[PDB]
Amino acid sequence: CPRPYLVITEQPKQRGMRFRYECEGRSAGSILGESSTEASKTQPAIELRDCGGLREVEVTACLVWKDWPHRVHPHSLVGKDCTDGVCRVRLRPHVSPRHSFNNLGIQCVRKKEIEAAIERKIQLGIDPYNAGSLKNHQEVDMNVVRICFQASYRDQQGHLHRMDPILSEPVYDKKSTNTSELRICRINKESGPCTGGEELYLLCDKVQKEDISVVFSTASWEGRADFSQADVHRQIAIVFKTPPYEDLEISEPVTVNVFLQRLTDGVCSEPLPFTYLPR
């Protein structure tokens, strides 16, 4: 027995999106799709399944927490057809691809701002899963929210139906440092021997001195260079000693791309070309 439902045919870029404060209004950088990549910019989309016979559906994108207690999240999705944390778009299949939410944007609140907003939210009747009344605030992440899509329709007689809620892949803030995509701007030099112990400077983007590592890669190889937290200068320049390569004496050098990797969630930069040499 088939029942209408919607699905996320494209999650929102899990990382790279910067949240904005009320005091900044909108911006030219909206939420992207998992795919994307500067050449083919994609937008987070959904689709309605087995919805024929439904003259028109209505979907409502609205951030919610992230884990088990999926209470309405303080921040709010700003953009087209929105108003409060809830971008709405009426729909009639005979298309049904659900656009993909184009300019969609997140507008973060302030660590103090919470309680109110989140409270003024349910007060306003916005809660995809319903929280409660006794204390709706504890440890809230202002750096990771999650889009929750919903859909509903009437039938013959007004009585509307609500097709089960759909969560999205967790979205992280680009400024929350610990939760941003790591990257390596420059790098001291790309030559260097194969032995190791070669001091190599590395100008990277924002990263915490107590949770950052750099690993040189190869054939299923993963050697990580050593360096103490006292080497990481103001989270923007990691300085390290070059590690050794899988015991080799070969005269023909090889590509051993390196990259930043977070000890917290393993996430990591986009590799950077560096090759060893002989003894």
């Binding site: 400077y201 100008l203 200068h233 320049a237």
Partner: protein
């Protein structure tokens, strides 16, 4: 030639944090240019040509051509309302100011603080035309402390509390010492001519902190310049910083060269990737003993010189 105040040890000037209100004043104590490693030295002044007991107070005045009240506030033991009142003079006429803290009002809550400061001052002496508006003075202390005063004037300070907030620079301040001698009845009412200290720059101000060349890449480069070097350093403003290499040739002059880099080659204010400049003499073979130092085009403040070596081709 008569009784007069005098600063003995001026405040440090650079390298002290104007801890914000929300930070909680309990953070440190403003030192004097000397307070060294294992030998502290605070800001102290001495009353001269007078050996009886006294009262020496201190407050924060703006920096620059004009001398008005600053919105920031001093904090400490014998302090209150941004004005520390130490006594001193029974037999010893020197007094120091230990654990002095410098508030730091938010650029927003300035005015209110000023207006409140000015007005409250429009009831006593030394604080009249010298402070608020040089068009009053009609105050300079009456006899009992006149009340809040009437409008117009109550609007003259407000109008001044405005023109001033606008031109107040919260990243710098000067301490103002004012000694009061005892005029009969033992009371302290003989107010000696005040003295202003040197400027004190907030180390949290990107435009005026200490410069430091924390470990850089290469400690030497070819005399052919064009040497791209990675430099790690303390906060800088790409647009106003420079890397000055230099040599003091034997009483014949003073050589100096500057590295190359676009305000883009400065990484998030702490790193600068530059290209070394051509030395003074290139055809030479003997290595060159030179010095490099970050420098602010604005204030000409300069970091510690780190030895650099120029090697020929």
């Amino acid at each position: 030639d008569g009784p007069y105040l005098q600063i003995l040890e001026q405040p440090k000037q650079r390298g002290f944090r104007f801890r914000y209100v929300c930070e909680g004043p309990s953070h440190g104590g403003l030192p004097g240019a000397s307070s060294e490693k294992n030998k502290k030295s605070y800001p102290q002044v001495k009353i001269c040509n007078y050996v009886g007991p006294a009262k020496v107070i201190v407050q924060l005045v703006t920096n620059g051509k004009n001398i008005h009240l600053h919105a920031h506030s001093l904090v400490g033991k014998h302090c209150e309302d941004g004005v520390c009142t130490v006594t001193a003079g029974p037999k010893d006429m020197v007094v120091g100011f230990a654990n002095l803290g410098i508030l730091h009002v938010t650029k927003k809550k300035v005015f209110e603080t000023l207006e409140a400061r000015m007005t409250e001052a429009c009831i006593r002496g030394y604080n009249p035309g010298l402070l608020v508006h040089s068009d009053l003075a009609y105050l300079q202390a009456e006899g009992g402390g006149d009340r809040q005063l009437t409008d117009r004037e109550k609007e003259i300070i407000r109008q001044a509390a405005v023109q001033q907030t606008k031109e107040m620079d919260l990243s710098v301040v000067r301490l103002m010492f004012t000694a009061f001698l005892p005029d009969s009845t033992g009371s302290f009412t003989r107010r000696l001519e005040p003295v202003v200290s040197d400027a004190i720059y907030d180390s949290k101000a990107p435009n005026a902190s200490n410069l430091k060349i924390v470990r850089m890449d290469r400690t030497a480069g070819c005399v052919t310049g064009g040497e791209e070097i990675y430099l790690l350093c303390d906060k800088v403003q790409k647009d106003d910083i420079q890397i000055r290499f230099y040599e003091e040739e034997e009483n014949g002059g003073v050589w100096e060269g500057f590295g190359d880099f676009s305000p883009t080659d400065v990484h998030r204010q702490f790193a600068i990737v530059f290209k070394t400049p051509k030395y003074k003499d290139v055809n030479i073979t003997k290595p060159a003993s030179v010095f490099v130092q970050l420098r602010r085009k604005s204030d000409l403040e300069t970091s510690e010189p780190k030895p650099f070596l120029y090697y020929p081709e």
